[PDB]
Design a protein around this ligand. Structure first.
Ligand SMILES: Nc1ncnc2c1ncn2[C@@H]1O[C@H](COP(=O)(O)OP(=O)(O)OP(=O)(O)O)[C@@H](O)[C@H]1O
Ligand SMILES: Nc1ncnc2c1ncn2[C@@H]1O[C@H](COP(=O)(O)OP(=O)(O)O)[C@@H](O)[C@H]1O
Ligand SMILES: [Mg+2]
Ligand SMILES: [Mg+2]
Lengths: 504, 234, 52, 70, 98, 117
């Protein structure tokens, strides 16, 4: 029935005539067309040429209009016809996009079929003000033992993942998508999360490897991926951050929850600098224009925690920023630091010393603080944060230390063994009830006699025990939320029973 | 294509800490005078004679002497044959005596012959490119006369777009597979220069050479704490 | 995976024949051009009455 | 444009009248999709068209030991 | 399906006390933790076999339905219980000796 | 004025070791997690007690999330009041996602109001 569906489309097609407000082309070069005419175009309005490419008019000058091109300029000759559409740029949005691969303009690139979305939304909208917001209180669970213990993330906070090349910045933001599967197949409607992933200027083979990683873990039925790759034109890597917040604001407007990841924002300031200097705008520091702060501020301020009178929705934003030689005092690493709330600083030195994920907790902060942790995690990690911070003071005495006080030998002894609890393999996100049990085994003092090399083998043995043989205790910390006095004694003989006969 | 393999070479630093892959893009970093041309001469010695299909060498902006020590080290090894129709290597050469409009269209001419074998035929192709920093630099010379404001330290404003327009044709598709080794000059030992620090997004295995190892006598000077791969995976 | 993959092979080969075969069929229809002008202006007569 | 429209509908029905299948493809589309599926079936699996699978498995021999007490 | 419970593996069952053979008793508890997770990996009921959509989506008939007719009325014989009795037999002799 | 004059605010550490001149400019070093937004909310309260002068708050390019918590932290401490006319501050908030011309004039709009009193 292949002939029937092709005959179906062409009778269902609309072949109607209209008017236009055209204007000829003056000088096409390097992706900037100059059009004479078009006397009633608004700023940032989408036009379309005679070949089929589309264009967004950025400069409204007296005798001409500067329009960037969504493609390649070898199809644009001098003396063409630039018709008018009559509308600012708009993307399809809805529930139907869940589990698809889209480019920066909402077309389908995965070849399954066209989007059946019935709604449409602008990309240039504003943030909510001061009144429709409320303070962040619910936890956003990542699944990394070092993030949820020391640098937590609430549901509406902006948290920056900053670090050099090749240190696991993409991998931290790829198991946070995997970890929300345990809520997304259940019943509790106010604990589900939806993830969006924006790739800005990466090669096509890398995105084709990451969709297969999220297809394997059955985590591409609630995730959308917006791909503006390296080969695509310079303005399509500019729209693609603003084409993802418009899909993450449909879930905030309708009482649901969301998550978005910009990978990465340091390749949007470069794809926008090229568009500026070809339109002859006045440069500034490192040849960036005067409004690169206004480019990133009005994208991150769209992440908000709404209140109950508007729906109770949320939007959480995680931008990735690549530094060069660990210098965060550059132009773009200081714009996005002063906008967001806290940073996660992944070093390269700790990655080869064995600490993986290589989160430096000396420089990582979060300014929502402890108000986004559950009551169980808050009780044990408040002492762990104080215990680790006393270790980092005395880390420089470990290389030659045996003639020190027994308190200082103790402070070294707990700091090494708390570090081994923080290491974690890739694509293994845990639960908060299993996370609080492992921290409780360490911060109390139940490990200062076990050898420091065995802390990993002890932990994988202990976790597989309490899943099968103590399942009714990890339902009274998940549902309770806090850890009571009854569960404090019940957990106390558990880690004493396992530690007694362990080495076998 | 999505499948990954491992292509064995025989070098101890490369196969241990940063393994190469069939149909994957490989990069050879490092400064001037550390061994990028010799290490790319080694992989024609090991890999290209044991390989079934053909091979293409594009030389972009390097010394015209060293295009004669390749034409005379490939006749005496029988890879180029001057008497019949059993040769296995093509060669495309635009060297550093050419005008700067001709050092920026030679690398597009290398991967046009190497696109014929992958697409119109089905064989497994290799591709060796040395150097590829002279594709970026030769476009930063014709730029200011075409009427463009310079960006950061002196490159063109369209730097990361025409680089990403060439580096998206060197891929493994569902019609063939192109292994590709590339030498990348790093200017005056600074990997934060805008020409080498944007090629990192297009490479699977990076082999960063270093002058601080080569001045010990350790040869090949490959940095172990700076070389990665995408298949270092248990 | 064989019944639905091979259907897309002749879905694209269907349109590969037609769009090269339309232009060789309409090139000699100059007798259709004398009505193509006569049908265009009546839509323009329908169109210029809209703004007026 | 309806007179242009039915001219398209005519050429779809002459494309429906087929007796040899791919007229414009020739050996190019025949050697492609036959080699493309066999390259994909090599990644898919060696399974027949009508052979239903049936097999059995061996469980571990639950052995015992001796221990003299009382 | 069928699933029977057990007793407490707390104090006695890991203290069998052989001739310094605490390793054999430690291996005895290690098999109970492994099989209980393998029983937690798969459920008691498998997925259901939709028959009606098989006829239309695989509409090249004959070869598709003949495998679906032979594999539908098959049977899965589980392994034997010959070693199940002899291991339980030595418990009867040792309990008379204890 | 032809003479220096000390402003008293009541705090023992401020008015003894680093006293405040009347009319001068004061620099507040320190950021988040140190207890800064309490010291703002308390110097509002003491000047309206010992001296009888109100205050203006001007948020120059400030975050929306942190410019909402300061609204509700002042409500729960009495210095602003939604029921009557016993408020002690006026808020001028030019937030961070506004064009770069609108973030530079906020410190002038929040100085006009301070010149009325
Ligand atoms: N927790 C971990 N433990 C061990 N290895 C890891 C871990 N996380 C990531 N890796 C490894 O690190 C390598 C690179 O990580 P990743 O690509 O996430 O870093 P990145 O800095 O985001 O990359 P890019 O620089 O291309 O953005 C991968 O090969 C991955 O296998
Ligand atoms: N196998 C090797 N190991 C270490 N150094 C080498 C080796 N082969 C050549 N070199 C050194 O590398 C230098 C530059 O060689 P070459 O690779 O031709 O230049 P470049 O890498 O700058 O193109 C030479 O001076 C030589 O001493
Ligand atoms: Mg990455
Ligand atoms: Mg060289």
């Amino acid at each position: 029935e292949v002939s029937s569906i092709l005959e179906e489309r062409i009778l269902g097609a609309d072949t109607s005539v209209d008017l236009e407000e055209t204007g000829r082309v003056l000088s096409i070069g390097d992706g900037i067309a100059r059009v004479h005419g078009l006397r009633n175009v608004q700023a940032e309005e989408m036009v379309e040429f005679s070949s089929g490419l589309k264009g967004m008019s950025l400069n409204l000058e007296p005798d001409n209009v500067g329009v960037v091109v969504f493609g390649n300029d070898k199809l644009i000759k001098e003396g063409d016809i630039v018709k008018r559409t009559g509308a600012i740029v708009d993307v399809p949005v809805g529930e139907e996009l869940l589990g698809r691969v889209v480019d920066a303009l909402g077309n389908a690139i995965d070849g399954k079929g066209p989007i059946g979305s019935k709604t449409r939304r602008r990309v240039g909208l504003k943030a909510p003000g001061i009144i429709p917001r409320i303070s962040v209180r619910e936890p956003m669970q990542t699944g990394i033992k070092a993030v949820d213990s020391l640098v937590p993330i609430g549901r509406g906070q902006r948290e920056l993942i900053i670090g050099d090349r090749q240190t696991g910045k993409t991998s931290i933001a790829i198991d946070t998508i995997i970890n929300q599967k345990r809520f997304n197949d259940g019943t509790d409607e106010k604990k589900k999360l939806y993830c969006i992933y924006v790739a800005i200027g990466q090669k096509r083979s890398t995105v084709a490897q990451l969709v297969k990683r999220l297809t394997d873990a059955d985590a591409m039925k609630y995730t959308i991926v917006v791909s503006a790759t390296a080969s695509d034109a310079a303005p399509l890597q500019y729209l693609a951050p603003y084409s993802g917040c418009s899909m993450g604001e449909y879930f905030r407007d309708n009482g649901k929850h969301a998550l978005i990841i910009y990978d990465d924002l340091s390749k949007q300031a470069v794809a926008y600098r090229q568009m500026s200097l070809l339109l002859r705008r006045p440069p500034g520091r490192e040849a960036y224009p005067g409004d690169v702060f206004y480019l990133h501020s009005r994208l991150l301020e769209r992440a908000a925690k709404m209140n109950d009178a508007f729906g109770g929705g949320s939007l959480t934003a995680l931008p990735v920023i690549e530094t060069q030689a660990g210098d965060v005092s550059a132009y773009i690493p200081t714009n996005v630091i002063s906008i967001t709330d806290g940073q996660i600083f992944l070093e390269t030195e700790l990655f080869y010393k064995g600490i993986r994920p290589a989160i430096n907790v000396g420089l990582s902060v979060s300014r929502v603080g402890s108000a986004a942790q559950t009551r169980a995690m808050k009780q044990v990690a408040g002492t762990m944060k104080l215990e680790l911070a006393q270790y980092r003071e005395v880390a420089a005495f470990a290389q030659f230390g045996s003639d020190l006080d027994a308190a200082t030998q103790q402070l070294l002894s707990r700091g090494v063994r708390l570090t081994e609890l923080l290491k974690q393999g890739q694509y293994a996100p845990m639960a908060i009830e299993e996370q609080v049990a492992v921290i409780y085994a360490g911060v109390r003092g139940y490990l200062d006699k076990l050898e420091p090399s065995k802390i990993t083998k002890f932990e994988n043995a202990f976790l597989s025990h309490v899943i099968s043989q103590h399942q009714a205790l990890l339902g009274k910390i998940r549902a309770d939320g806090k850890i009571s006095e009854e569960t404090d004694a019940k957990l106390k003989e558990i880690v004493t029973n396992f530690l007694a006969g362990f080495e076998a | 294509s999505v499948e990954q393999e491992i292509l064995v070479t025989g070098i101890k630093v490369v196969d241990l800490l940063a393994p190469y892959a069939k149909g994957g893009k490989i990069g050879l970093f490092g400064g001037a005078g550390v061994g990028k041309t010799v290490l790319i001469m080694e992989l024609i010695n090991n890999v290209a004679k044991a390989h079934g299909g053909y091979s293409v060498f594009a030389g972009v902006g390097e010394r015209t002497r060293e295009g004669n020590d390749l034409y005379h080290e490939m006749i005496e090894s029988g890879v180029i044959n001057l008497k019949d129709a059993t040769s296995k290597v093509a060669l495309v050469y635009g060297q550093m005596n050419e005008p700067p409009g001709a050092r920026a269209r030679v690398a597009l001419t290398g991967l046009t012959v190497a696109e014929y074998f992958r697409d119109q035929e089905g064989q497994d192709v290799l591709l060796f490119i040395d150097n590829i920093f002279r594709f970026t630099q030769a476009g930063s010379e014709v730029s200011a006369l075409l009427g463009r404001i310079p960006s950061a330290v002196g490159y063109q404003p369209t730097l990361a777009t025409d680089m990403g327009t060439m580096q998206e044709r060197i891929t493994t598709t569902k019609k063939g597979s192109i292994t590709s080794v590339q030498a990348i000059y790093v200017p005056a030992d600074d990997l934060t220069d805008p020409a080498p620090a944007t090629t990192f997004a297009h490479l699977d295995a990076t082999t960063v050479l270093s002058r601080a190892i080569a001045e010990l006598g350790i040869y090949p000077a490959v940095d172990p704490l700076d070389s990665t791969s995408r298949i270092m995976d248990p | 995976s064989v019944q639905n993959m091979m259907r897309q092979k002749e879905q694209e080969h269907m349109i590969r024949w037609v769009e090269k075969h339309v232009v060789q069929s309409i090139s000699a229809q100059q007798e259709k051009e004398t009505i193509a002008k006569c049908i265009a202006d009546l839509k323009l007569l329908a169109k210029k009455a809209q703004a007026q | 444009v309806q007179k242009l429209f039915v001219d398209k509908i005519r050429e779809y029905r002459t494309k429906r009248q087929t007796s040899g299948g791919p007229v414009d493809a020739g050996p190019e589309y025949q050697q492609d999709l036959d080699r493309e599926l066999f390259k994909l079936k090599q990644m898919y699996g060696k399974a027949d068209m009508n052979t239903f699978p049936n097999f059995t498995f061996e469980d571990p021999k639950f052995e015992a030991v001796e221990k003299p007490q009382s | 399906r069928k699933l029977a419970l057990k007793a407490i593996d707390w104090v006695a069952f890991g203290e069998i006390i052989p001739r310094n053979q605490k390793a054999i008793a430690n291996s005895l508890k290690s098999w109970n933790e492994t099989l209980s997770t393998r029983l937690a990996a798969l459920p008691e009921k498998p997925p259901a076999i939709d028959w009606a959509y098989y006829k239309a989506t695989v509409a090249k008939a004959g070869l598709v339905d003949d495998f679906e007719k032979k594999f539908n009325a098959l049977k899965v014989p589980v392994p034997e219980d010959k070693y199940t009795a002899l291991v339980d037999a030595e418990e009867q002799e040792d309990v008379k000796r204890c």
